Write a protein that binds this ligand. Sequence first.
Ligand SMILES: COC(=O)[C@@]1(C)OC(=O)[C@H]2[C@](C)(C1=O)C(C)=C[C@H]1[C@]3(C)CCC(=O)C(C)(C)[C@H]3C(=O)[C@@H](O)[C@]21C
Ligand SMILES: COC(=O)[C@@]1(C)OC(=O)[C@H]2[C@](C)(C1=O)C(C)=C[C@H]1[C@]3(C)CCC(=O)C(C)(C)[C@H]3C(=O)[C@@H](O)[C@]21C
Ligand SMILES: [Ca+2]
Ligand SMILES: [Ca+2]
Ligand SMILES: [Ca+2]
Lengths: 140, 140
Amino acid sequence: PTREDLVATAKLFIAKYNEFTPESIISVRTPNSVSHRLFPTRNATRNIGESMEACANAKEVFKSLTVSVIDDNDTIVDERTRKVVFYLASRGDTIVGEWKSECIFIFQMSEDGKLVDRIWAGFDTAYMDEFESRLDGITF
Amino acid sequence: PTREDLVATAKLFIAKYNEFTPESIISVRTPNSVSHRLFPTRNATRNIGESMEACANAKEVFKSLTVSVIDDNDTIVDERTRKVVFYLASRGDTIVGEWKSECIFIFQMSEDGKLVDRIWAGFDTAYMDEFESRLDGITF
Ligand SMILES: COC(=O)[C@@]1(C)OC(=O)[C@H]2[C@](C)(C1=O)C(C)=C[C@H]1[C@]3(C)CCC(=O)C(C)(C)[C@H]3C(=O)[C@@H](O)[C@]21C
Ligand SMILES: COC(=O)[C@@]1(C)OC(=O)[C@H]2[C@](C)(C1=O)C(C)=C[C@H]1[C@]3(C)CCC(=O)C(C)(C)[C@H]3C(=O)[C@@H](O)[C@]21C
Ligand SMILES: [Ca+2]
Ligand SMILES: [Ca+2]
Ligand SMILES: [Ca+2]
């Protein structure tokens, strides 16, 4: 799997991620793939089944989601470990207004390089708390 | 620079980092290097002078601080862009209590591979906020 192969699969994962349905967000993952969150405070680990369910729940708050690579020149590819790293802007339309943040995504690809076998996600965990405070303030 | 060369320079940066003096935290950096903090809530860019001043400021609060690569299997190396990614455990003692967190460090090396030429650091921003809250509450 070439450097170009690995980037393509990760960029496909991002595309289906932005479609943001439970089926689309697993469409580029292997059956035993797991998603990890970085950092202790929002730590979490999701298999395919758990990821689908987190998506359906997140859809009750996020009306629309776009993550995009900020700069293709900052992308990191490790051909030996089949890993790709993106630094991403995150943009959301939610029931309490605008979501705007950045995150880092690390993908390890399957041996053939066509699917995502493992994900690590580093989010701005202070911003998450701030967003949850916005959610907690919904007032009829 | 080989894969092994890039990792060695990054491990050396960590060794000197753990000495935690202004002289040591610059001793594996090119003089025009800049250190970026990731994530909007804590975004910052520091040249060498600013890094030395920040280390001296940190030493006013931190009695001790050590970082360590948790597992060499997590490490990511891009020979073409000369980049190394570490996932680290950070541990220290401070005037407002214990420090315990994890962070992701990204290094881009110089052309010869022997020095760090740019750094990106992703911290657990909610944990930093909580730590700053302890600092912002000093009262005698
Ligand atoms: C990285 O992929 C994931 O973490 C997946 C597998 O699990 C998730 O929970 C994802 C999830 C379900 C995952 O795929 C997806 C699709 C999106 C994650 C979002 C909503 C993406 C935008 C974000 O920055 C935040 C931090 C708001 C994310 C989450 O809250 C994640 O928690 C969420 C819902
Ligand atoms: C790569 O090294 C760095 O990131 C340097 C150059 O810049 C920094 O910002 C570093 C800094 C100046 C950098 O060298 C150093 C020495 C330490 C960073 C600490 C104090 C390390 C422990 C941490 O987890 C926290 C989040 C408390 C760090 C910071 O606050 C960093 O912000 C700090 C002060
Ligand atoms: Ca000071
Ligand atoms: Ca002291
Ligand atoms: Ca403050």
